[PDB]
Structures are given as structure tokens and as C-alpha cells.
Structure 1
Amino acid sequence: ATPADWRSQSIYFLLTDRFARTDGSTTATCNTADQKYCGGTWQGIIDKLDYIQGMGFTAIWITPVTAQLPQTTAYGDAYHGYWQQDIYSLNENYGTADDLKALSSALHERGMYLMVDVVANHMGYDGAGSSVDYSVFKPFSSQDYFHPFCFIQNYEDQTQVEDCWLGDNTVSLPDLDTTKDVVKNEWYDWVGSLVSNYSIDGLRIDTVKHVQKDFWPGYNKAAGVYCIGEVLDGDPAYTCPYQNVMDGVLNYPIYYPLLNAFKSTSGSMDDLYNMINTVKSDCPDSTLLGTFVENHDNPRFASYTNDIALAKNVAAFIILNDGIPIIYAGQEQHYAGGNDPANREATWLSGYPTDSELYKLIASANAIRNYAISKDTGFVTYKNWPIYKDDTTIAMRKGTDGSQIVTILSNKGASGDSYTLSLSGAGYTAGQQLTEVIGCTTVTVGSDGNVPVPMAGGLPRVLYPTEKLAGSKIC
């Protein structure tokens, strides 16, 4: 689907091997330390779409679907999908081609989109870079398709970052020479066929900073759908320029200050506030970026603090910020795993409860976002504007005048005192009645235009004009 089509989406990102098994078991063993295939499948995802859609998500992003290296290495199996070897075969662990097609059909059946994770940078190999038998890669069955074997020693050296290999001598990641026309033509033809065969609506591209810039325009075009790239860097000056060769990129610039602002009661609200303005100003289009605070490459939010008020605040931010919201499976169940492999916990071990605190929060946030968008076609391109900020609060406004959503976030935590915040700059007309769609209560805009926001337990507050909510089943 197009970039314009994707702006209104909300993504639930999941690891296919760790989300849902075909049998639907909630007890099937999965110790992250073992790093093996735990049994998640595409059919399993289909059976749990009610669970996902029940949170208000409009799309899912699943890990890579290509055939991987077969071995159980010293670092485990290729359960995550980032160690591919045969791109014209699917990973039998997740199911068959028919199953992947059934998944895309099941999503479309619900008016949802399927986003697939793809890797163009490298293959995977069990063993030292010197022992690589290039004949096992399809269609790149020759070392002529790859860059000479070297590891990335200095990540500040862009040439090294692009020309040398990821991984190490235990599990090496043969780096494709993406400067060669043969490699480009192959990848471009492949991606177009992949999207066509499985009716894929969008792509998430892995390790974009590791491939030279001139590769991506042709890739994005051949894909024929919206593409969001993973550029793993917190500097907006480094990451945002990739949006000039790709539709969107993951918002790593916001990630760091967002995490720091809420991971404790003493986080910097200033850094988050300024980064919102910086991305708003320096990135080609902030509304085509993907907002997140949790994924499989960083410790989960709850690993820093189990304060569920802090967790609710950051979840609210991800859903209401500029761009496409992205929640990582397990976040809604307050998962707290640390770095790889601790952050690849099986979602099924939680039992899938739909009444968990974070499930309800996400459902309420997505609900008003989805509704607002059906109310206001200008919402998605209306730049999120930070309207207020202090030591423990940040407030923002997004949406056309008269239909805007005003969000107030706090890092005071669950023990936060109860008080009233006189919020100014919300843009609402004096006397207008509003609804706090999270706790479902009403508040009237003061005669001065300021909103007397009832603050308690460090809970986030999301406001929207009450009259606009008629018809909705919200609150």
C-alpha cells in the first residue's frame, strides 16, 4: 500500500517464532536463553488476530520469511529470521507459502495490513567468515556477489559500516556487494515478486545504514509499497537523511530521549520536547516515521522500571506522536526482558489476557486515534506540536482546530500525587466540553481557554471534544 495509506496505520510488531503457535498453546516451552525455534507460526498469528485487532491495531509487522541457515549454531537457531540463505524458499518453521498467503488474506479480511521484515544487506552463515561455502546461498551462490571478508571495527567509518561484515566468526553475516548491478537487479526483482506473491502491503527494511544509499531508491520503487527502514542511530542528522531514499525510517532519534524521559521519575522532559521539535523540523516528513520505545534490539521498557503508570505514559506517546505507532508484542503484557535474547520472550506464555492494564491502555489510545482519523483527514499530516513542559510533564497537540487530540504525559509514576494542571495552549475554544478518553471522564475548557486537567497516579490524560465523540463507542 502507499505511504499516504500507511500514515493512518498502527502497527503491532511481532516475532513469528515467538508470538503464537499453530496449536495455540500458552505453556509450550520457550526459554529465551536457549535461542532455539519455539514454534511460532503464521497460522498461529491468524488464530490470534482478534487479540491483536482488539487493541486497535490496523497492521502487523512480522519478522523475515526467507529460508534461513539450518544449523543450530553456538548462538542458537535462526528463529528471528535475520540469517537468511535461500531467498526463494520460505522458512519451513513458520509454515508454507499457502500459510503466508492465508495470513495476508486473514489480515485483509479484517481491513488490516501485512508488513514484512526484509534483509538486503547480508546472508547468515554458521561459522567463520573464512569458512563460508558460498554455494549454499540462493541466488547469490558465489563469493563474487559479496564484499571481501572484514568485520566492522569502527562504526563511525561509514565506508566500513557499508563494506564490511556484521556478526563475527561464530555466526558470520556474509555482506552482499550491493554496489554490483547483478546484486541490485536480483534484489529488485526479488522484492517485487515477494510483495506480489504474498499480497504484502508494506515492508520494514533491516540494517539500512549498512547498505550504500544509492541502493535504496531502486529497492523501494521495485517493492511498490511503503517502506520503513531501520537506521540504528539516535542522531537525527544521520538517520533522517535516509528518508530521502526511503519512504520512512524508524524513529530512533525519538527513542532514546523518550525512553529516558519515562524510564524513571527523574527523566529529562526537555530532551524529549526538543527532539520532537528537531525531528519535526529536520526530518523530511515526521509523519512517515515509526514511533516506538520497545523492540527486539534493546532492553524492554519494563526492564528499567515496572511502574505501570510510566509504561502507560510511554505507550500513549507512541500511539499519539507523529507517524506510525509501533508496539512490540509483549509490551502490552508488560514484558521486562533485557538485551538479546532476553527481549524475545514468547507472547503466548502470558496467556494473551485482554484485560491487562497495558492492553486496555493501548486499546483506548488506538481507539481515539482511529476515531479521530476517521473524523479528520488532516490529522495524520498535522505536525504534533509540544504545547507544554516541565520537570515531570509534557503535553502535545495534534489534529485540526476543533478536532485536535491533546495529550498530557507524566513521569511522576504510580505514587504521583493528585492535583490539577492548568493546561494552556490546547487550542480548544473557551467553554468547550472535553472527554478524557483514557479514564473516561469529562472536563470543560476554562473561560480562559485553559484546561483544568485532573492529574492523579501519574496517569496519562488524552483529551478530545466531547460532542465529536457522539456515535463512537468511546467512553
Structure 2
Amino acid sequence: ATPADWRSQSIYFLLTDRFARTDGSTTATCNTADQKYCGGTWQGIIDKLDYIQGMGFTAIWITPVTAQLPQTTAYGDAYHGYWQQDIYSLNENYGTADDLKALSSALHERGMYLMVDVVANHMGYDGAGSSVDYSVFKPFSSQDYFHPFCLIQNYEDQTQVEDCWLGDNTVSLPDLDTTKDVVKNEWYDWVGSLVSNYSIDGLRIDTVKHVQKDFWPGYNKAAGVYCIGEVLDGDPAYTCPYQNVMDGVLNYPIYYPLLNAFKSTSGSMDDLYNMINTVKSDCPDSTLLGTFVENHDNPRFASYTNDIALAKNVAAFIILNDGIPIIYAGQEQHYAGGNDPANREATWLSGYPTDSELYKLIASANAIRNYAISKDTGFVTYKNWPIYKDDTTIAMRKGTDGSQIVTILSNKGASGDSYTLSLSGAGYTAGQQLTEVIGCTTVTVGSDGNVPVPMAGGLPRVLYPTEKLAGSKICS
């Protein structure tokens, strides 16, 4: 699927090993501290697609699929998929090729997209760099395919970042020499064949900043689908230019201020407002970025605060910001694990309740976004516009005039007081009736064009014209 196709999507990102087991058990042990395979499979995903689609997600992103190093290293097993050794074999822990094809088929039967995580930068090896036996890598079974062994010491030295090997010296990540035509050709052929083999609709590309930029346009082209790159850096002046060589990047610039704004009742709305505006104006296309506040490489949101209202506001922002929402499996069950490995909790241990607080919030937010998009072909290309902020509030507007969603977010938390915010600049006509879709209530725009937004319990408010909602099952 093209970048234009992907703009409307909403992604549930999951770890294959940790989302669902073939036997569907909700009690199977998964102690994250052990850092061992817990048994999640591709077949498990298929069996739980109703759970994912009931939240209004239109796509999944799954961790890498290639065969991994076999060892339990000092840092655990390769359950996460980022330590590949044989790119022409699948990771048997997750199932067979027929299972992976069955997963893409099942998603397509539901009108959903499959996004697969891929690594081009490195292989993986249990041991120090000097102990690597290059003959275990397929097809790159020789030192000649790799950069000389060095480590990345200074992330301001872009040559080091690209040419040196990742990690400390415990589990080596041999760095492929992606400047060699033999490596480009192999990777390009591989990725095109992967996408075709398995009818993949888009790719998430790992470790993008660690490969020189001239590699990525050909890789994205060979893939034939939308590619969103992991460029792990909060500085938009560094990260957003990667959109000149790839369709999209993960919105790490927004990540850091977004977390700070909502992780406590003293978070800075100013910093989030400012970063929204910087990304919107300076990044090549904010509507092709992926918005997130939770993933497998940072502490989960609830590790910072268990306040359910703060979690609802950040989840609402992720769904209604420019670009593609990305929710990390477990976020909807208020998982609270800290840094790796603690943030790789097994989703099945929640019991997959479809009535949890954040399941419902996410279902409502995706519902209105999916509905609004189906009625407004300009929603996804209308750049989100922050229209108001104060010490505890940020309000934003997105969508064509007459059909815009106006979202009011708050960091007052669950004990927030009850008051009315007179919101100016929402662009609705006087007397427009609006539905607040999270709580299924109504507000009418005042004669002065201001919206009287009831605020209470620090809850997010998502407004959309009642006429436009018409006879949808949202708030029926």
C-alpha cells in the first residue's frame, strides 16, 4: 500500500513473541526479567484479531520475522527479532511461512494492513566482536560484507553512527557495509521478495540512522510499499530530513514533549505545543509520521504515572495528531513496565479484556477518526492545528471546515476539578451542535463562536459536529 493509502491507518504495534500464543493461554508464564521466548506466534495473532480490530485499529506492526541467533545470550534470547542471522529463513518460534501468509490473509479479509519490522543495518551474534564467526550469517557469510569492528561512541559523529557496530560488546550486532553494491543489491532483492512473498502492505524499518542515507531511497523503492523509519532522535532538524529518503519516520521529535506533557500534572503544554508547530512547518510531511508515546525501547507511559485520565489524554493525542497513530500492545491494558526488558510484557496475561478503561477510550478515539476520515477526504492532509493552551490544557483542530474534530486535552489528572473552558478558534459556526464522543455528550457553540467545553476529572474531550455524526453507531 502506498503512503497515501497509509495516511488513514491506525497501527497496533505488537511483539510477536509476547502478544498471543497458539494455544490462546492467558496464564502462560512470561517473566520479562528472564528475557526468554514466551511462545507468541503468528497463529496467535490471527486468533486475537477481533480484540485488536475492536479498538478500531486498521493495521498491525509485527516484530522482525527472520531467523535469529539461537543462544540465550547474557542479554537473553532473540525473542524480539532484532538479532538476525539467516535472512532466508523465518524464526521458527513464531510459526511457518504458511502461518505468516495466513496472518496477512486474515488481515486482508478484515480490510486491515500488515506492517512488518525489518532490519538492514546488522546481524546478531552471541559474544564479543572479536569472537564473531561470520560464516554463521546467511547470505553474508564473510567478514568482507561487514564494516570493520568498532563501536559507536559519539552520536554527533554521523560517520561513526553509520559505519560502526551497535551495542556494547556483550551481544555483537555486526554492521553490514551498506555502501557496497553487493549488499545493496542483496537487500533490495530481499525486501522486494519479502513484500511479494507475504503480501506485506508496509514496512517499519529499524535503525535507520545507522545506515547512510543513499541506501534508503532504493530500499524504499524495492519494497514497493510505504516505509516508516525508526530514526531514534528527538531533534526534528536531525530526524525529519530522513523523510527526504524514506516515506515516513517515527515521530520521536513529538515523543519526548508529549510524554512530558502528560506524564504528570506539572507537564509542559508549551513544549508540546511548540514541537507540534515545529514538526508541522519544518518536517517534509507531518502526515506521514507515526505518532506514539509507548514502545519496546522506552519505559511505558504508566511506569511514569498510573493516573488513568493522563493515560486517556495521551492515547487520545496519539490517535488524533497528524500522521499514523501507533499504539503498543499493552498500552490499552495500562501496562506499567519500565525499560527493556520490563516493557515487553505478554499481552495475554491481561486476559484481553475489551471493557478496560483504555480499550474503550482507544475504541472511541479510533472510531471517530475512522468515521471522520470516511466523510472527509481532507482530514488526513489537514495539518493538525493547536488552537489553545494554558498551564494544564492544549486544544487542537484537524479536519475540513464544517467537519473538523476539535480535541481538548488536559493534564489535571483524574482528580481534576469541574469547570467550563470557553474555547475560541475552533472554527465552528455559531449554534453548531457538537458531540463529545468520548463521553457521548453534546455542547453547542455559543453566539460569540466560542465552544463552552465542560471539563472534569481531567478527561479528554473530542468534539465533532452532531449533524456529521448523524446516524453512526458512535454514541447511539
Q: What per-residue deviation string (whole Å, max 9, x for no partner) do you get for residues 151-186 of structure 1?
A: 111111111100000123221000000000000000
Give the match's secondary structure for 1:380.
helix
C-alpha distance in structure 2 between counterparts of 1:155 and 1:236, whole Å = 15
Counterparts of 1:330 and 1:114, CA distance in 2: 19
Deviation per CA, 1:419-465: give whole Å up to 9, x if none: 00000000000001000000000110001110000000000000000
Q: Look up the SS of the partner of 1:188 in the other structure.
A: helix
2:413 paired with 1:413: yes
CA distance in 1 between partners of 2:77 and 2:148 (Å): 26
Other structure's SS at 1:167 match = coil
Task: Please give the alpha-carbon distance, in whole angstroms, between the structure 1 residues aligned to 2:474 and 2:128.
Answer: 56
TM-score by length of 2: 1.00
CA distance in 2, matches of 1:75, 1:169: 11
Partners of 1:86 and 1:167 in 2: CA distance: 20
**300-309 vs 160-169, which deviates more?**
160-169
CA distance in 2, matches of 1:170, 1:383: 44
Gaps of 5+ in 1: none
Give the structure 1 partner of residue 170 of structure 2: 170
- Secondary structure of residue in 2 paired with 1:242: helix
Q: CA offsets per residue over residues 168-223 of structure 1, 9 Å max, x none? A: 32210000000000000000000000000000000000000000000000000000
- Measured in 1, the distance between the counterparts of 2:169 and 2:258 equals 35
SS in structure 2 of the partner of residue 117 of structure 1: strand
Which residue number corresponds to residue 228 of structure 2?
Answer: 228
Partner Cα distance (2:392, 2:446) in 1: 23
Structure 1 contact 393–409 (Cα < 8 Å) conserved: yes
SS in 1 for 2:443: strand
The answer to whether the Cα contact below 8 Å between 1:129 and 1:168 also exists between their aligned partners in 2 is no
Find the aligned partners of 1:30 and 1:184 in 2 and give their Cα distance. 38
Q: In structure 2, what is the Cα distance between the partners aligned to 1:132 and 1:434?
A: 63
- Pairing of 1:194-209 with structure 2 (within 5 A): 194-209=194-209
Confirm or deny: 8 A CA contact 1:386 1:394 kept in the other structure: yes
Q: For the Cα contact (< 8 Å) 1:241–1:284, is it kept in 2?
A: yes
2:354 is matched with: 354
Distance in 2 (CA, whole Å) between partners of 1:197 and 1:162 is 30
Distance 2:94 2:471 in 1: 41
Query: Normalising by the residue count of structure 1, what TM-score does the alignment of the two structures yield?
Result: 1.00
- The answer for the alignment partner of 1:462 in structure 2 is 462
Q: In terms of mean alpha carbon deviation, does 222-231 or 126-135 score higher?
A: 126-135
2:179 is aligned with 1:179:
yes
What do the CA deviations read for 1:343-390 (whole angstroms, capped 9, x no partner)?
000000000000000000000000000000000000000000000001
Q: Give aligned pairs, total.
A: 475
Aligned equivalents of 1:375, 1:336: Cα separation in 2: 36
**Structure 2 SS opposite 1:446:** coil
CA apart distance, 1:49: 0.2
Question: 1:471 offset after TM fit, Å?
Answer: 2.1
Structure 1 residue 252: Cα displacement:
0.2
Distance 2:169 2:453 in 1: 57
Cα deviation, 1:285-327, whole Å, max 9, x if unaligned, reads: 0000000000000000000000000000000000000000000
Task: Give the distance between the partners of 2:330 and 2:435, measured in 1 at CA.
Answer: 29
SS of residue paired to 2:381: coil
Q: Deviations over 1:51-83 (max 9, x none)?
A: 000000000000000000011111111000000
| Of 394-403 and 160-169, the range deviating more from structure 2 | 160-169
Runs of 4+ off more than 4 Å: none
Aligned twin of 1:277: 277
What is the alpha-carbon distance in structure 2 between the residues aligned to residue 220 and residue 443 of structure 1?
Answer: 46
Find the residue that maps to 2:362 and give its secondary structure: helix
Identity within the alignment, %: 100
Distance in 1, Cα, partners of 2:105 & 2:471 = 30
User: Quick one: distance in 2 between partners of 1:405 and 1:460?
Assistant: 13
Provide the rounded CA distance (Å) in 2 between the counterparts of 1:391 and 1:352: 36
The 2-side partners of 1:56 and 1:307 are apart by 23
Aligned to 1:454, the other structure's residue is in SS state strand
* Secondary structure of the corresponding residue to residue 379 of structure 2: coil
Query: Residues of 2 paired with 1:419 and 1:28: CA distance?
Result: 46
Residues of 1 paired with 2:293 and 2:254: CA distance? 9
- Cα deviation code 1:60-115 (max 9, x no counterpart): 00000000001111111100000000000000000000000000000000000000
Please state how far the C-alpha of 1:9 moved relative to its aligned partner: 0.1
- Distance in structure 2 (CA, Å) of the matches to 1:241 and 1:465: 37
